[PDB]
Design a protein around this nucleic acid. Structure first.
Ligand SMILES: Nc1ncnc2c1ncn2[C@@H]1O[C@H](COP(=O)(O)OP(=O)(O)OP(O)(O)=S)[C@@H](O)[C@H]1O
Ligand SMILES: Nc1ncnc2c1ncn2[C@@H]1O[C@H](COP(=O)(O)OP(=O)(O)OP(O)(O)=S)[C@@H](O)[C@H]1O
Ligand SMILES: Nc1ncnc2c1ncn2[C@@H]1O[C@H](COP(=O)(O)OP(=O)(O)OP(O)(O)=S)[C@@H](O)[C@H]1O
Ligand SMILES: [Mg+2]
Ligand SMILES: [Mg+2]
Ligand SMILES: [Mg+2]
Lengths: 257, 315, 497, 330, 256
DNA sequence: TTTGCCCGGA
DNA sequence: TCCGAGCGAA
DNA sequence: TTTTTT
């Protein structure tokens, strides 16, 4: 077919999809010769998810010409569940397609399971939203960010991130009181994966809705480290690196009341 | 964007609120001397209820406003659970304020709160009054249960008179350098019907549209209130003139048949100059037509027939 | 710590002892007598009651309108007799689960706080015992499922004194308390019972109150003492003299607009005064429709129940009472049609005002006058319940006999059942116990049970009513009938319906 | 979309793209355009009957304010979406209180067909609208003001869209004719305008049907005959013949004339009733009782027709109603 | 800061709070130069909780002037659960506080988390609990008491305790019949920690609710043993001894 | 100034 | 086996 | 299951 992309095991694609399933409903995949990119926007238009999968994630990949596949994530996840984590999963599409084929095939037997999901006429640009020179760029292990978010979300519906010279501060103020976590950069040559990195030109102070961060931290299952890029005038970028590509969340900050 | 005039010229101090003079004076007295009672502020839309409560709270609490005020409105969750936990805890919390000052719970649009939730407030109001005071604002005061009305000072706001609206409008007009004629401001007041929000909105609309605020420019964009047109229709002496009003001023302006019939009911209800039994007969006929329209037969012929039957009655 | 000029007037002038409470002196004395002899009455398992009859109640229920001194009285009596107080109210969760896990354990437990407060005091018998106060029982909404029944249980099974408080004693949900509580009514206090207090407040706060206007104030707030004190507090901020020159507008501004309860709604709606020229000018059409909206599930039913029970004062010239009643009945029928439309799948709530006019206001306007007797609760609800029961029974009988008959259920009631009566009952009358076998044969032919027999005999009306006939049948025949029936098997038409 | 815009229904192919293509609402267009120009956008309410240009105008405004990428910068909700209290408190409140993802600027929330929202949701909207005014503006659209709460109405600047007047419809028709290479006679244009009741959707739908009804649309000309054919509507001459027969002939002849005229082109009875009512409205009558009887009886007949019934009996009812009412004229 | 009290390991305060968190909702702490004393009374007013923590429990302790801090147990508990057990915990308070600061520090990783908890209005003065002339005083390992209470809880909703000469009897009579446990003072030199000690002046007999005792025995995790003091008709005292302080439960008995 | 049937549970 | 919750559902 | 106020 025009597009043929084989995942060695369907579990890879299932985990990738589960990494952002809860935040958005409709997703637009563009497949090109260099791989598959995808974008989605949440119902309130406050959060945007951007996925990139390179050809190295695939055992075999072929995309003769660019193609766009719009689909609902609930139907896709329902179908992905009908297949086994061990089977080989081939995504197949034809030119000007009305559906996407998910082909679950196991080499042990001669059992083929072919699903066809009807596609939507979702006409929307991606805009490649990424500001060039972000004010502050930091990176830290995913488990620690998850813990900070989970602790502070019990206190308030909003979480403030303040970046200043050599210090990252998370703050939440609520009905029963307030909490404040301060971390500092540190390089540990024995365990680089625990490192906390901070580069910054302009200090930053931005407020975010807690429920959105609670959704965003679900990407921690796909990467041990999370990168955070912040600017005074731009959405905040939360990036989780995959073995081949990436999962990005662009979250708009609250208006300064 | 720039602020709409309604928000740009929202009063920040009690002395900028027009109308309801005696009550506003009492509120200024309280703000100066502390010891704020529980209070219920009620009245028609856009006459300064939310403005008054917020101004009073700001003047009372000064810089302690952020920690000393809990505001909840219809956009918030206000079920029995919230009343029993969040409001109770806020009433119980420590907060040192100067003598004569208390924490304030503002319950805006309180008439949408359930009866059970209101019941849950009674003893919290009573037990913690040495540190917390409650301000309710509502449009329909009869929706606040009697036990809560018992614990509150009753402040019923009246509609704004033409003079209060004129004074506030002149203040804004001088601040904004607006050119106007007396007929223009009288048209604004006429179409506002005592709602200051609408008066300012229509002033902005006229200025944006045509620059100069005279009667003709006002009526180019602002409609005369259709309840008054409907009243004219109902009071006409002969059937042909009433039908002429229906045809020209309502049906061919785009007002829906359901809007016309519901307004006819509401206006007939309040026609104090027509004896009540006649209004009951008219209401019966109007309701017949209303039911037909709701079945999907909302044509001009049905409204004309309604008018003919009302004419048969009042004859 | 808290200054006196920072307190609400209702707090700084709260009664500190039972003497300072105004009005309802007999009710307060009733409560005090009940609590003072509680231990003596307990020593007799609450089986002996004295002159007042209060010795057979472990619980007391106080009731009355708002702001008259109920909570004050309960707390003050408990303190005067030296008990420790455990209080819960509508701000607490009082569901069956929470009640059973919480306050239940205190019904027969000493108080640690009471013990340690009066540990030094010698011979303080009441200090270690509880008085449990359940305030605002009428406020227990869906957040307190099972609460009222559990509280009634406690009122029967408590070993420590319990006082309940409510505003609306006559509500249906308050029925369970009927036979297990000592009911103490609090009424609106009169102006004389509080004149001295109000004037003392005027002296203390330094504003001029003319006593002659106090009555009007009392009328303004409907005897709500809390509200009258609130009114004085608020008015005196800028107005330092309340007299005949300002009482009118103060009374207008602060008037109690309280919704009425169903019997009251029916009484006011059918009063002829409000439908006269002057009365209509004073009590407007909008006000009458608002009466409908006070309780919009019972008002149409109440009007339809009572609109025949008046002597009308609004009759038009030459119009007899019957003609007015016929006009009202026609309008009530039209109102029913509107009501059907409102609660259909369309959900046409915008017709609610129209319904108010058609079901309540217009017919009442036709027959308004004086009541020729008491206002009665609607009979439609109970009759509808009874009819539903009998239609259920008819459906059951119909589908038992379905395999044998040829008819719908209505034809079963109108045509078949009268002949079944002659095959199933009359043979008993004419033959004693000799008809048992024949009756059983018919029942078997039509897949009928003994329960079906009872149901069938219940259906007949007029000269064919069966209750007295069957009551007369000798017990021998009934016992033999039941024994022979239970001695054999019987065919079944529908297993596990 | 699929293939070209030539595959679209004319009601959608001719949807205005910019404010200059909205016709017959000049005062509103001028006011709102200068609102945008000066940066003073208040909370708007567009109130009006079907097909007068409300949705077109608000979408054109969004396009002008935000450019071609408006669709990712506004929150548009209509009756096809859930808008309960939960949606107001979460989706709408979050969008109102948060910055734009794509391009910096103020937020626009469009509540199309707002008369479909419940009272509780509308009340929840009040302080959302007021609290976030600095950065967010709401536009509400409605056909029925009575389902909107007084508090919501107070907070919006109201603009009434009128039934489209004759001149605007004529200009739009001229544009359509040019683009479709269509010809339209003057009487046909008059008939079209008359039957549209100032609803542009009706004009465009009828015109598309008329073009489909021609044999050769290049040479054939849309005459009023074509309009009546495709609409299955009475000619004015038929209406006048029926009314004359009713007012001047005996019962047998009037019944015969009604039946024959109806059978000629299979006319519906309700259409004859509408046309005759329009004709009779212009009559000068000596007695008000004539007008009363006519209106009440004809309204009763229209209502009974709406539920089905016996067509022949209803036609005889119309004849008898008109004759009996004019008896009062003496 | 007027009050600064530092636990080397936050786990201590956490276990202390977990000792009595499930039986009360509001607790009043009084901090003075000599340490901290807390009091709480349950909603039913049947149980009283007294806590003393001395200076020896603190790596560092300073408190210029006495201060009272009213706190809700649930909020403090969640805040503490947002803290590392191995971290250093500092309770900080300023003059006439409206809030109390809990400051967790991990100096190994240079990670600081500061939480602020809003204080409450408690209008209840401290109760005098001066030592009473108890009729009977016994002591036994906490585990035995916990097991006995748990085993007798199912039989009945109440538990009776009788202390007689060299005999301690627990009884539960209810829906599942009558269950009794009898113990005697025995001294085992091999394991002194498990000794049962008794000292009786007069015979004693009280009854108590089962749920209250189930809540009380949750304090076993703080002390290896528990001491019990009883009187003719008075609140029973259940004391767990901490390293530098104690946790006491005063339980009001049933009547008769 | 409050009916009739009769829940779920003991 | 006894009891009445909550709803009007014939 | 809840329309309106002046
Ligand atoms: N008495 C007033 N004096 C000056 N401005 C007023 C007055 N009343 C209303 N306004 C103006 O209208 C706007 C709205 O006033 P609000 O106090 O919010 O009305 P409201 O009585 O609370 O309306 P509802 O009950 O929420 S519909 C204010 O920001 C002012 O700009
Ligand atoms: N008989 C009274 N005598 C003196 N003051 C009274 C009296 N009744 C009410 N008050 C005053 O109003 C305040 C409240 O009295 P409460 O006893 O709480 O009334 P209530 O009957 O319990 O009202 P509800 O049922 O809670 S709305 C008192 O503290 C007094 O200041
Ligand atoms: N003023 C107008 N100018 C030009 N075309 C119009 C105009 N009004 C309606 N139309 C045409 O009719 C179609 C529908 O217009 P809309 O603006 O969507 O109507 P609407 O006012 O939103 O109707 P409702 O209220 O949703 S029934 C447009 O696509 C246009 O083709
Ligand atoms: Mg307001
Ligand atoms: Mg009370
Ligand atoms: Mg539209």
């Amino acid at each position: 077919s025009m597009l043929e992309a084989k995942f060695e095991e369907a579990s890879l694609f299932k985990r990738i999809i589960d990494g952002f399933k809860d935040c958005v409903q409709l997703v637009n995949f563009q497949c090109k010769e260099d791989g598959i990119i995808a974008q989605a926007v949440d119902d309130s238009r406050v959060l945007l998810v951007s996925l990139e999968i390179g050809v190295e994630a695939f055992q075999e990949y072929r995309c003769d010409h660019p193609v766009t596949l719009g689909m609902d994530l609930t139907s896709l996840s329902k179908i992905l569940r009908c297949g086994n984590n061990t089977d080989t999963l081939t995504l197949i599409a034809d030119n000007t397609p009305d559906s996407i084929i998910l082909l679950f095939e196991d080499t042990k037997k001669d059992r083929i399971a072919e699903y066809s999901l009807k596609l939507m006429d979702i006409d929307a640009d991606f805009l490649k939203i990424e500001e060039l020179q972000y004010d502050s760029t930091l990176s830290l292990p995913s488990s620690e960010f998850s813990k900070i978010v989970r602790d502070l979300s019990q206190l308030s519906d909003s979480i403030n991130i303040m970046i200043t010279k050599e210090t990252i501060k998370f703050v939440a103020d609520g009905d029963i009181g307030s909490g404040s976590v301060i971390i500092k950069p540190f390089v540990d040559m024995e365990h680089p994966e625990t490192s906390i990195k901070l580069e910054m030109d302009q200090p930053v102070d931005l407020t975010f809705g807690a429920k959105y961060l609670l959704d965003i931290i679900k990407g921690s299952s796909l990467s041990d480290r999370v990168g955070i890029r912040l600017s005074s005038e731009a959405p905040a970028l939360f990036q989780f690196d995959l073995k081949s590509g990436f999962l990005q969340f662009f979250l708009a900050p609250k208006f300064n009341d | 964007l720039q602020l709409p005039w309604v928000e740009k010229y929202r009063p920040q101090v009690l002395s900028d609120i027009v109308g309801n003079k005696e009550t506003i004076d009492r509120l200024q007295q309280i703000a100066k001397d502390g010891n704020m009672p529980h209070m219920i502020i009620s009245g028609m839309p856009g006459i300064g209820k939310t403005t008054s409560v917020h101004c009073l709270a700001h003047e009372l609490l000064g810089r302690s406003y952020a920690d000393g005020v809990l505001e909840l409105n219809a956009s918030d969750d206000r079920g029995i659970d919230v009343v029993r936990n969040q409001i109770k805890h806020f009433a119980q919390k420590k907060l040192h304020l100067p003598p004569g000052k208390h924490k304030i719970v503002i319950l805006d649009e309180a008439d949408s709160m359930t009866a059970g939730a209101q019941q849950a407030l009674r003893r919290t109001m009573e037990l913690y009054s040495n540190s917390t005071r409650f301000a309710f604002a509502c449009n329909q005061s009869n929706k606040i249960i009697e036990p809560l009305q018992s614990r509150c000072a009753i402040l019923r706001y009246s509609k704004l008179s033409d003079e209060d609206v004129l004074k506030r409008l002149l203040q804004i007009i001088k601040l904004e350098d607006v050119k106007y004629t007396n007929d223009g401001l009288e048209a604004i007041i006429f179409t506002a019907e005592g709602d200051m929000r609408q008066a300012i909105n229509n002033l902005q609309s006229t200025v944006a549209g045509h620059g100069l605020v005279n009667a003709d420019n006002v009526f180019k964009i602002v409609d005369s209130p259709h309840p008054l047109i409907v009243k004219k229709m109902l009071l006409a002496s002969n059937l042909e003139d009433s039908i002429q009003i229906l045809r020209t001023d309502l049906w061919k302006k785009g007002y829906s048949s359901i809007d016309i019939v519901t307004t006819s009911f509401r206006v007939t209800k309040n026609l104090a100059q027509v004896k009540e039994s006649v209004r009951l007969e008219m209401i019966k006929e109007i309701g017949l037509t209303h039911m037909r329209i709701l079945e999907g037969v909302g044509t001009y012929l049905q409204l004309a027939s309604m008018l003919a039957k009302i004419h048969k009655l009042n004859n | 710590v808290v200054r006196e000029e920072d307190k609400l007037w209702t707090v700084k002038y709260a009664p500190t002892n039972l003497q300072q409470v105004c009005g309802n002196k007999g009710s307060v004395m009733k409560l005090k007598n009940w609590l003072a002899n509680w231990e003596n009455s307990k020593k007799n398992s609450f089986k002996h009651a004295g002159k007042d009859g209060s010795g057979v109640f472990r619980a007391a229920m106080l009731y009355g309108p708002p702001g008259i001194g109920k909570t004050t009285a309960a707390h003050l009596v408990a303190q005067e007799l030296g008990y420790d107080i455990l209080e819960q109210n509508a701000s607490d969760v009082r569901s069956k689960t929470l009640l059973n896990a919480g306050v239940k354990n205190a019904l027969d437990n000493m108080s640690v706080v009471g013990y340690f407060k009066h540990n030094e005091e010698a011979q303080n018998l009441n200090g270690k015992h509880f008085v449990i106060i359940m305030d605002e029982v009428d406020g227990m909404s869906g957040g307190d499922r099972g609460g009222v029944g559990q509280l009634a249980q406690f009122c029967r099974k408590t070993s420590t004194p319990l006082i309940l408080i409510c505003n609306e004693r006559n509500l249906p949900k308050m029925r369970p308390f009927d036979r297990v509580c000592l009911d103490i009514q609090f009424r609106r206090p009169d102006a004389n019972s509080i004149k001295s207090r109000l004037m003392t407040i005027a002296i203390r706060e330094k504003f001029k109150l003319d006593p002659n206007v106090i009555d009007r104030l009392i009328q303004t707030t409907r005897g709500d003492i809390r509200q009258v004190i609130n009114l004085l507090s608020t008015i005196s901020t800028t107005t330092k003299t309340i007299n005949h020159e300002n009482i009118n507008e103060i009374s207008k501004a602060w008037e109690k607009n309280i919704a009425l309860k169903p019997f009251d709604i029916a009484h006011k709606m059918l009063d002829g005064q409000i439908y006269s020229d002057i009365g209509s000018r004073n009590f407007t059409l909008n006000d009458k429709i608002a009466l409908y909206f006070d309780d919009f599930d019972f008002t149409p039913l109440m009007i339809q129940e009572n609109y025949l029970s008046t002597r009308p004062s609004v009759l038009k010239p030459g119009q007899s009472h019957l003609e007015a009643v016929a006009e009202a009945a026609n309008c009530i029928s039209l109102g029913d049609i509107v009501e059907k439309k409102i609660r259909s799948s369309e959900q046409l709530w915008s017709l609610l005002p129209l319904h108010a006019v058609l079901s309540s206001v217009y017919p009442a306007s036709k027959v308004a006058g004086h009541m020729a007797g008491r206002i009665n609760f609607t009979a439609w609800l109970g009759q509808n319940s009874k009819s539903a029961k009998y239609y259920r029974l008819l459906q059951e009988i119909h589908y038992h006999t379905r395999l044998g008959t040829s008819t719908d259920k209505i034809g079963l009631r109108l045509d078949y059942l009268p002949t079944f009566r002659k095959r199933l009952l009359d043979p008993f009358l004419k033959q004693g116990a000799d008809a048992i076998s024949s009756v059983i044969e018919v029942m078997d032919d039509y897949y009928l049970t003994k329960e079906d027999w009872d149901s069938i005999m219940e259906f007949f009306v007029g000269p064919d009513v069966t209750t007295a006939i069957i009551k007369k049948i000798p017990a021998t025949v009934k016992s033999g009938f039941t024994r022979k029936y239970n001695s054999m098997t019987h065919p079944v038409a529908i297993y596990r319906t | 979309e699929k293939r070209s815009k030539e595959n679209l229904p004319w009601v959608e192919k001719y949807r205005p793209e910019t404010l200059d293509e909205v016709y017959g609402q000049n005062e509103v267009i001028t006011t709102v355009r200068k609102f945008v120009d000066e940066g003073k956008l208040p909370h708007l309410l567009f109130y009006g009957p079907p097909g007068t240009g409300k949705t077109s105008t608000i979408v054109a405004l969004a396009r002008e304010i935000y450019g071609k990428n408006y669709s990712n910068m506004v929150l548009e909700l209509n009756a096809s979406d859930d808008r309960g209290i939960d949606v107001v408190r979460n989706q709408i409140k979050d969008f109102a209180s948060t910055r734009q993802i794509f391009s910096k600027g103020f937020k626009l929330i469009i509540l199309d067909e707002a008369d479909a929202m419940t009272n509780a949701a509308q009340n929840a909207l009040r302080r959302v609208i007021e609290r976030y005014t600095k950065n967010t503006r709401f536009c509400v659209l409605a056909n029925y003001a009575h389902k909107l709460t007084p508090a919501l109405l107070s907070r919006c600047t109201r603009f009434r869209f009128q039934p489209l007047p004759q001149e605007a419809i004529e200009r739009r028709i001229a544009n359509v004719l040019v683009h479709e290479k269509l010809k339209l006679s003057p009487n046909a244009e008059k008939a079209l305008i008359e039957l549209s009741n100032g609803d542009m959707r009706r004009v465009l739908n009828v015109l598309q049907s008329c073009k489909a009804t021609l044999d050769n649309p290049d040479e054939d000309e849309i005459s009023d005959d074509v309009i009546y054919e495709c609409c299955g509507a009475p000619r004015p001459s038929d209406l006048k013949a029926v009314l004359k027969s009713i007012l001047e002939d005996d019962w047998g002849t009037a019944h015969y004339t009604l039946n024959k005229v109806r059978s000629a082109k299979g006319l519906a009875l309700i259409d004859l009733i509408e046309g005759i009512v329009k004709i009779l409205e212009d009559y000068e009558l000596q007695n008000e009782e004539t007008r009363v009887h006519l209106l009440t009886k004809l309204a009763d007949i229209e209502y009974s027709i709406s539920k089905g019934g016996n067509d022949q009996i209803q036609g005889s009812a119309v004849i008898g109603a008109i004759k009996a009412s004019f008896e009062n004229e003496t």
